[PDB]
Amino acid sequence: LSGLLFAASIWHWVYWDLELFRDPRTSNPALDLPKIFGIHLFLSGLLCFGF
Amino acid sequence: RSGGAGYRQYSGDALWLPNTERPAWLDGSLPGDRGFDPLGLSRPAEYLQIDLDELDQNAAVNKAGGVVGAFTPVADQVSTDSLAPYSEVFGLQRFRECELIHGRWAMLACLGALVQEGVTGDSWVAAQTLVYNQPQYAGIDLPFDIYTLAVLNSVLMGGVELFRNSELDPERRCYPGGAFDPLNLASDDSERTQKLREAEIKHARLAMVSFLGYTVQAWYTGEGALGSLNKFANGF
Amino acid sequence: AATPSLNNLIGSVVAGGLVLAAIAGAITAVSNFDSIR
Amino acid sequence: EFYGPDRVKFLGPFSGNTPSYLKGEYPGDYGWDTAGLSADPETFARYRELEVIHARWAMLGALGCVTPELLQRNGAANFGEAVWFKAGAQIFQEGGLDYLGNPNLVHAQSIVAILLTQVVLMGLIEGYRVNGGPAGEVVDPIYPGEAFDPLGLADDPDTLAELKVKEIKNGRLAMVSMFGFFIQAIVTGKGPVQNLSDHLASPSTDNFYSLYAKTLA
Amino acid sequence: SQWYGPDRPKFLGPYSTNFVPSYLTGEFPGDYGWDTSGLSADPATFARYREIEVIHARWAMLGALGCVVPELLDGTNHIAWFKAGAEIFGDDGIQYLGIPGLINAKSIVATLIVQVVLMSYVEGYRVNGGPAGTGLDAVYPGGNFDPLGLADDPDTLAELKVKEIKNGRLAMLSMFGFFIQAIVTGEGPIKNLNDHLADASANNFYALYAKNLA
Amino acid sequence: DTGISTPLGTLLKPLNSEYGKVAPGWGTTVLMGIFMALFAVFLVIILEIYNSSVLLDDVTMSWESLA
Numbered sequence: 001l002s003g004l005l006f007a008a009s010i011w012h013w014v015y016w017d018l019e020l021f022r023d024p025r026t027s028n029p030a031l032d033l034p035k036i037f038g039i040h041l042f043l044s045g046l047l048c049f050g051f
Numbered sequence: 052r053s054g055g056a057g058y059r060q061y062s063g064d065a066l067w068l069p070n071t072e073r074p075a076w077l078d079g080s081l082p083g084d085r086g087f088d089p090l091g092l093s094r095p096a097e098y099l100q101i102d103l104d105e106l107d108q109n110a111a112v113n114k115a116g117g118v119v120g121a122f123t124p125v126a127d128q129v130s131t132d133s134l135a136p137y138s139e140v141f142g143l144q145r146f147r148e149c150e151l152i153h154g155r156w157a158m159l160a161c162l163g164a165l166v167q168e169g170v171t172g173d174s175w176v177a178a179q180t181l182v183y184n185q186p187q188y189a190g191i192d193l194p195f196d197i198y199t200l201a202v203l204n205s206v207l208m209g210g211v212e213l214f215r216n217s218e219l220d221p222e223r224r225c226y227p228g229g230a231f232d233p234l235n236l237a238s239d240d241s242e243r244t245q246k247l248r249e250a251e252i253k254h255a256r257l258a259m260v261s262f263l264g265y266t267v268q269a270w271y272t273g274e275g276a277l278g279s280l281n282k283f284a285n286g287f
Numbered sequence: 288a289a290t291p292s293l294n295n296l297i298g299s300v301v302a303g304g305l306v307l308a309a310i311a312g313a314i315t316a317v318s319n320f321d322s323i324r
Numbered sequence: 325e326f327y328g329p330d331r332v333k334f335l336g337p338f339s340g341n342t343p344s345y346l347k348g349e350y351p352g353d354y355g356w357d358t359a360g361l362s363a364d365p366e367t368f369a370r371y372r373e374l375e376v377i378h379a380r381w382a383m384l385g386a387l388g389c390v391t392p393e394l395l396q397r398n399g400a401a402n403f404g405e406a407v408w409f410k411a412g413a414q415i416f417q418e419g420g421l422d423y424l425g426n427p428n429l430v431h432a433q434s435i436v437a438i439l440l441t442q443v444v445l446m447g448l449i450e451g452y453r454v455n456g457g458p459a460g461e462v463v464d465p466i467y468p469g470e471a472f473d474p475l476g477l478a479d480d481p482d483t484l485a486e487l488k489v490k491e492i493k494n495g496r497l498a499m500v501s502m503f504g505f506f507i508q509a510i511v512t513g514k515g516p517v518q519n520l521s522d523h524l525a526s527p528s529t530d531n532f533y534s535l536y537a538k539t540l541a
Numbered sequence: 542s543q544w545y546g547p548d549r550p551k552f553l554g555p556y557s558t559n560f561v562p563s564y565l566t567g568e569f570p571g572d573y574g575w576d577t578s579g580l581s582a583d584p585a586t587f588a589r590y591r592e593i594e595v596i597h598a599r600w601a602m603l604g605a606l607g608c609v610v611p612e613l614l615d616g617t618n619h620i621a622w623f624k625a626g627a628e629i630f631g632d633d634g635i636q637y638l639g640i641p642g643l644i645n646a647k648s649i650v651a652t653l654i655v656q657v658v659l660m661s662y663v664e665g666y667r668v669n670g671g672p673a674g675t676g677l678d679a680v681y682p683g684g685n686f687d688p689l690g691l692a693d694d695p696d697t698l699a700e701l702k703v704k705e706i707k708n709g710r711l712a713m714l715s716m717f718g719f720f721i722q723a724i725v726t727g728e729g730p731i732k733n734l735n736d737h738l739a740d741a742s743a744n745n746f747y748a749l750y751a752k753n754l755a
Numbered sequence: 756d757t758g759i760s761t762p763l764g765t766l767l768k769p770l771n772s773e774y775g776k777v778a779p780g781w782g783t784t785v786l787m788g789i790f791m792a793l794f795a796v797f798l799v800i801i802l803e804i805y806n807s808s809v810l811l812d813d814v815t816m817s818w819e820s821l822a
């Protein structure tokens with residue numbers, strides 16, 4: 001797993017200019033943290049329940 | 052046969068409280084519109100846009116973003132976005148789709164729990180573990196290990212739900228018709244279609260509350276649907 | 288089945304709420320009476 | 325017969341003089357205000373509302389104090405305390421209060437919560453009865469109708485007139501009988517249904533005389 | 542259309558062309574020209590009689606189905622229709638489909654009380670109109686009573702009405718069979734049918750009860 | 756100028772498209788405070804159990820609880 005994460009680190013580093021990361025209203029790099037928190041919290045609760 | 056002998060005819064739309072008024076956002080066009088939105092969930096949602104915070108270290112002062120302005124987005128606009136088709140979460144048409152989908156499952160579930168308990172004698176809650184330990188239907192052992200069934204259920208339901216999400220018409224997302232209305236009972240705009248849709252949501256809301264009864268009764272009493280019924284009768 | 292130790296814990300929670308409410312009530316009363324402009 | 329100047333009177337033929345303010349136009353008017361308590365028209369209106377509210381409660385109370393006792397001694401159901409003057413004590417038991425003796429009905433355990441819930445619910449209900457609310461707006465403080473007459477038994481005004489009399493008449497009988505329930509309970513610790521059975525068993529020996537009475541001195 | 546008019550089929554087959562009552566012309570469904578008695582000569586009685594037939598018909602069709610289902614299902618103990626009412630007096634009471642907890646009815650008086658109150662409202666609404674409908678045909682109200690709009694076409698309604706009466710008359714005749722077969726055989730209609738199916742020459746009315754009927 | 760486009764990126768784009776969208780005023784802050792107070796009360800209770808400041812009858816709060 002460490003090797004795969006290392007390879008993904010190189011890719012996500014070289015290809016940093018993804019249209020996913022740009023705010024559609026101003027075309028600037030931004031993150032909708034309130035929504036990202038909800039996404040990454042849902043996974044945490046789902047993974048907590050499964051364990 | 053004028054009638055008016057065994058009932059008091061009442062003028063006005065039947066609402067959830069004898070003396071109330073419909074919310075401005077509930078006109079009464081949709082089936083089952085009984086004027087019930089006390090929390091105003093379907094009410095048009097107002098929003099304010101905050102400007103992007105300055106986070107450039109090449110600048111002397113990095114102030115926080117202010118209110119670019121207020122905006123009320125138009126709801127009920129389905130888009131090609133697979134992961135979030137609707138423009139707004141809080142929209143009457145989207146909630147209606149959720150109400151029908153939540154409702155149609157509960158109608159199937161309420162009937163299913165009753166039938167399996169009358170056939171196998173096992174509670175609907177207890178049947179979950181029993182089938183997991185031994186896959187079976189109607190007392191017949193199924194020719195499939197639970198592991199394959201688990202992957203199959205996820206894949207089958209995954210494909211089915213992805214097909215359902217392909218529709219872009221908000222009304223057709225709630226009433227697809229076509230292959231799902233082979234008898235052409237409510238594929239028109241007649242009053243029969245309106246009455247049938249009124250019957251569906253009523254049976255749907257009943258099933259949602261009823262299945263909420265099943266799970267709460269199983270938590271408290273411990274028995275299933277038929278079991279709770281028998282326990283109550285004997286409790287006297 | 289509630290133990291006397293549990294009753295005091297619940298009472299302390301209630302007492303803590305009354306201390307918080309008595310602080311908030313005093314602050315709101317003075318803030319409303321001695322308002323600015 | 326029950327309205328107008330020729331209405332029947334509480335003293336029958338011997339009624340003779342009747343209060344001038346106590347004319348017809350109101351249900352249950354038998355020309356009985358010998359105490360002259362409703363001389364003021366404003367007070368008469370208030371007393372009329374008090375009578376019908378005391379009457380409606382009495383009808384509910386009369387039926388409600390007899391049914392659990394009837395069911396218990398008829399074998400229909402087993403209650404914690406069938407007799408009305410003891411049904412309140414059910415909350416002070418091992419199983420709390422179970423409706424119809426079924427542990428899976430209501431199953432109340434805290435008299436406070438019962439008291440708190442009644443205060444909130446009755447307070448709002450009585451407020452709605454005096455200022456309108458979810459059930460309807462106020463037109464007649466004692467005869468709302470509308471949501472309170474869904475069956476439409478009083479749609480015709482002629483039937484509404486005679487029906488109001490039936491309610492006050494049945495109500496008044498309930499008030500007298502419920503007043504009896506209070507006294508019979510104190511004089512006889514037995515429930516009112518038990519008293520009726522005893523009077524039927526031996527009316528000569530089982531009655532307010534040939535028993536108690538002398539004890540009341 | 543074959544079921545109406547003067548060319549309609551008649552109860553006496555070929556031997557009915559010269560034997561037709563004047564009042565029976567072919568306007569109403571189920572007209573086979575069978576009015577040998579003087580009944581329904583006056584239109585007022587004929588109109589009244591036509592409704593009673595459809596009512597007795599729709600009732601019989603419900604009765605014919607309901608006198609067989611419980612006897613054909615397990616859990617109900619294959620109870621005979623003429624022996625179903627007594628169950629209310631059993632210790633278990635009336636548990637629908639045999640599933641305990643369903644109705645658990647045990648008071649015959651309570652059942653009759655609700656039936657009288659509900660049926661009186663229902664029958665009253667059917668005669669003087671009511672919430673379901675007002676100003677509609679007495680026997681064919683439709684509307685709330687025709688949700689699937691199966692009879693929207695007048696032509697379809699006419700043929701369907703012929704289907705309703707012919708099925709009803711068969712049910713009425715078979716219900717009369719249930720009454721007599723039970724009073725003679727003492728067994729439920731399904732049991733009587735099964736016995737015939739097994740040994741028809743032995744298990745039939747003539748070879749079993751005809752001799753003791755006098 | 757629009758950035759690199761990928762099939763996975765266009766799929767996930769709707770989830771990152773409401774950067775500054777807020778509910779006017781205090782929103783559900785009062786509702787949030789209720790859950791915080793409930794969480795604060797819950798944390799106190801479990802703290803008391805471990806600290807033995809609350810002695811529940813069923814819990815033993817020792818290694819004998821393993822048995």
Ligand code: CHL
Pocket residue numbers: 622623624625626627628629649652653656720723724
């Ligand atoms: C068309 C309606 C109807 C019919 C035909 C019957 C028939 C019968 N019931 Mg019955 N019931 C009916 C309605 C009702 N029953 C009951 C409650 C009971 C109980 C509790 C019992 C019966 C029983 C019986 C049977 C008596 C024993 C026997 O073998 O008799 C055979 C006799 C016949 C076949 C001759 C009768 C045939 C005729 C066509 C009947 C016509 C009835 C009409 C309704 C006419 C009504 C006229 C007036 C009153 C309006 C019998 C077959 C008993 C039973 O099941 O025994 C085991 C029993 O214990 N019934 C209720 C209230 C819940 C009813 C409500 O509508």
Ligand code: CLA
Pocket residue numbers: 165166168169170277600603604606607608610611614617620625626628635636637638639640643644646
């Ligand atoms: C004029 C027509 C007519 C009349 C007068 C009757 C009269 C009667 N029927 Mg009957 N029936 C009829 C038509 C008729 N039926 C028809 C056409 C059918 C075919 C569908 C049936 C099928 C039928 C059955 C299966 C049973 C009766 C029964 C009865 C008797 C008691 C009914 C009862 O319990 O209360 C009224 C009934 C109801 C109010 C129905 C309640 C709704 C049910 C219980 C819900 C559906 C089942 C439910 C999902 C079960 C949950 C668990 C399950 C999934 C395992 C009664 C004398 C019962 C009996 O024991 O006979 C003595 C009995 O079990 N009938």
Ligand SMILES: CC1=C[C@H](O)CC(C)(C)[C@H]1/C=C/C(C)=C/C=C/C(C)=C/C=C/C=C(C)/C=C/C=C(C)/C=C/C1=C(C)C[C@H](O)CC1(C)C
Pocket residue numbers: 356357358359360361362377378379381382384385386387388389407408409410411412499500502503
């Ligand atoms: C006319 C005249 C004229 C001139 O003026 C003179 C004079 C004399 C003054 C007058 C008269 C008057 C009178 C007679 C009065 C009376 C009254 C009454 C008795 C009332 C009651 C009244 C009464 C009433 C209301 C009652 C009510 C009841 C109730 C609520 C009950 C409840 C209950 C129940 C159910 C059961 C349980 O377990 C218990 C309880 C819970 C408890």
Ligand SMILES: CC1=C[C@H](O)CC(C)(C)[C@H]1/C=C/C(C)=C/C=C/C(C)=C/C=C/C=C(C)/C=C/C=C(C)/C=C/C1=C(C)C[C@H](O)CC1(C)C
Pocket residue numbers: 575576577578579580597598600601603604605606607608621622623624625626713714716717
């Ligand atoms: C046309 C003509 C002409 C010339 O002119 C003359 C003449 C010849 C006379 C005529 C004829 C006539 C006729 C034929 C008649 C018949 C009738 C009938 C049989 C009816 C039935 C009728 C019958 C009917 C309705 C039936 C009904 C039934 C029912 C509801 C049922 C019920 C039930 C059920 C389900 C089940 C259970 O367990 C039981 C009960 C509860 C019981």
Ligand SMILES: CC1=C(/C=C/C(C)=C/C=C/C(C)=C/C=C/C=C(C)/C=C/C=C(C)/C=C/C2=C(C)CCCC2(C)C)C(C)(C)CCC1
Pocket residue numbers: 001002003004006007
């Ligand atoms: C001193 C000290 C400290 C610090 C510590 C640390 C921080 C350490 C580090 C650690 C680490 C951080 C380590 C690391 C490791 C890693 C590794 C060792 C890697 C591995 C990898 C490999 C082996 C390969 C893989 C691959 C690739 C790349 C690709 C694909 C294929 C494969 C998978 C093969 C502290 C704080 C404690 C304090 C005290 C003192």
